[PDB]
Amino acid sequence: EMEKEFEQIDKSGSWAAIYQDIRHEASDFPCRVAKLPKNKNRNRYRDVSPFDHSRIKLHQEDNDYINASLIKMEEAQRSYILTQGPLPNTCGHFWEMVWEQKSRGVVMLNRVMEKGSLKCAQYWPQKEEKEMIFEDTNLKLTLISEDIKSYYTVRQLELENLTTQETREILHFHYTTWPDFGVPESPASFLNFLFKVRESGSLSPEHGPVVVHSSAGIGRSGTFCLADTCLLLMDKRKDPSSVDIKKVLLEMRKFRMGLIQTADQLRFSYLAVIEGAKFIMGDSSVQDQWKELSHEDL
Ligand SMILES: N[C@@H](Cc1ccc(OP(=O)(O)O)cc1)C(=O)O
Ligand SMILES: N[C@@H](Cc1ccc(OP(=O)(O)O)cc1)C(=O)O
Ligand SMILES: [Mg+2]
């Protein structure tokens, strides 16, 4: 099982080598659409692009490109859309995607400003009375309510297709203390947050895939999805030992490049899954422990 493997890798001090082996074995598929000259201003990073086979296509006749990938986990029966933090000119495309893909939740794992630089546009309204209208995609977005915790905030937003007047409730789960190329403060804080997303019903198969993003949509995003899928896998079978975490990560990498950006994020993923397995296997009390340990109260 992964716990024994975690021990071997830890004692050997080989997280860097294990992680590097994953980078070496990772899939390489073309990203020709992402690289078209007309799409230059739709990519936040030159080196992070969606593969053509798994990219999400916007349903507009103009230009259907958005730096977003559909991670379809067949065995686990869960899909996620991993995307970069929207740019000033792609906020309308972002919400168009949320609408068209029928997503119920948006998981944001970064902050708008990190390390003195703008890593993501302010794509949602910060005040109820100042709603946002994305003219290019004909969508209106209104902040309905906000529940601010110590290291994450949950928001209820109302997305409206101005063309048809149909409205939908979108839940925003914002993890505010996870530095890029870094790991969460503890497996507890992370699991507490993941469980809040799960409890909301945003990951349910009755909804479109949850949209997960960070700045690039691969590091922190990849860590979140890897832990969730691994937990879901062992949950379906109620068998912790049936999950090969490296293999699951490689499977995800068939859909988007660079998922999990550092060896420590991989190590953290193992920790999160191993700890989460306690809940999956019947000890529901650990959830309350995580809530305590996370110190979510201000
Ligand atoms: N390598 C580039 C792009 C990059 C940025 C962030 C990143 O992680 P995340 O997906 O967690 O935002 C991954 C890659 C950079 O370091 O700026
Ligand atoms: N951090 C990289 C993003 C990235 C990293 C790795 C990657 O694939 P691989 O790990 O196999 O090299 C793909 C994309 C960059 O922005 O330069
Ligand atoms: Mg106010």
UniProtKB/Swiss-Prot annotation:
One GO term (biological process): negative regulation of cell-substrate adhesion
GO MF terms held by the record: cadherin binding; enzyme binding; ephrin receptor binding; insulin receptor binding; non-membrane spanning protein tyrosine phosphatase activity; protein kinase binding; protein phosphatase 2A binding; protein tyrosine phosphatase activity
Recorded superkingdom: Eukaryota
Metal-binding in keyword set: no
Reactions accelerated catalytically: O-phospho-L-tyrosyl-[protein] + H2O = L-tyrosyl-[protein] + phosphate
Tissue expression remark: Expressed in keratinocytes (at protein level).
Membrane topology label: Peripheral membrane protein
One Gene Ontology cellular component: postsynapse
Post-translational modification Phosphoserine, affected residues: 49, 241-242
UniProt keyword list: Acetylation, Endoplasmic reticulum, Hydrolase, Membrane, Oxidation, Phosphoprotein, Protein phosphatase, S-nitrosylation
Record's function text: Tyrosine-protein phosphatase which acts as a regulator of endoplasmic reticulum unfolded protein response. Mediates dephosphorylation of EIF2AK3/PERK; inactivating the protein kinase activity of EIF2AK3/PERK. May play an important role in CKII- and p60c-src-induced signal transduction cascades. May regulate the EFNA5-EPHA3 signaling pathway which modulates cell reorganization and cell-cell repulsion. May also regulate the hepatocyte growth factor receptor signaling pathway through dephosphorylation of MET.
Name of the protein in question: Tyrosine-protein phosphatase non-receptor type 1
Species of origin: Homo sapiens
Encoding gene (name): PTPN1
